[PDB]
Design a protein around this ligand. Sequence first.
Ligand SMILES: CC1(C)C(=O)Nc2ccc(Br)cc21
Length: 209
Amino acid sequence: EVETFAFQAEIAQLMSLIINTFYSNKEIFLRELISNSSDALDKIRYESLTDPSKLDSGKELHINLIPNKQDRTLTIVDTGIGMTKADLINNLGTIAKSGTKAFMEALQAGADISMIGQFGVGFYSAYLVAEKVTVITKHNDDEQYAWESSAGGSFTVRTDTGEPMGRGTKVILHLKEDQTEYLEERRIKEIVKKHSQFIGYPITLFVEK
Ligand SMILES: CC1(C)C(=O)Nc2ccc(Br)cc21
């Protein structure tokens, strides 16, 4: 059972700008997704300070980066607070309508795409490098769901029958053919060191056979 939704017009416009604008500094997508994971880990940590049972779904707070050259995917896994189905539908827990408005005003006022995270819509920078994005998520108060979009104005949501997650979010980037450098270990390491050196959770870069 798969539900198909239209993006709000402003979000579809944001996605088309990210996909169509000539902009060489694509590597910032990874900083933005790691920052989002850190924010989600902060949220479950704060909740756990007054209710330790919030971590019954997993005590470890971490970020894993998993490249797969055979599938041409880069997956960012975190054990943060996760998202409910309602969160997924509501622009993956963001205030994307107002954030997009502020971002596009900044772009015509000097700013560049790399500042996207300052407007709360950094997730969508995934489309700098991915032709399709799948988001698997599990929040303590809901079931496990899969969100997916190849842009083009729509996204899908379905209950996820895949591997149970416990709690958190997996962002699966199905990379564009010409963006496979982001599967190479030395390139990922360079980006993490350059942009994510102060993230307060362990970031483990998995290696491949
Ligand atoms: C914003 C979004 C979708 C992301 O890009 N990464 C991540 C991690 C945890 C949660 Br909850 C939500 C997210």
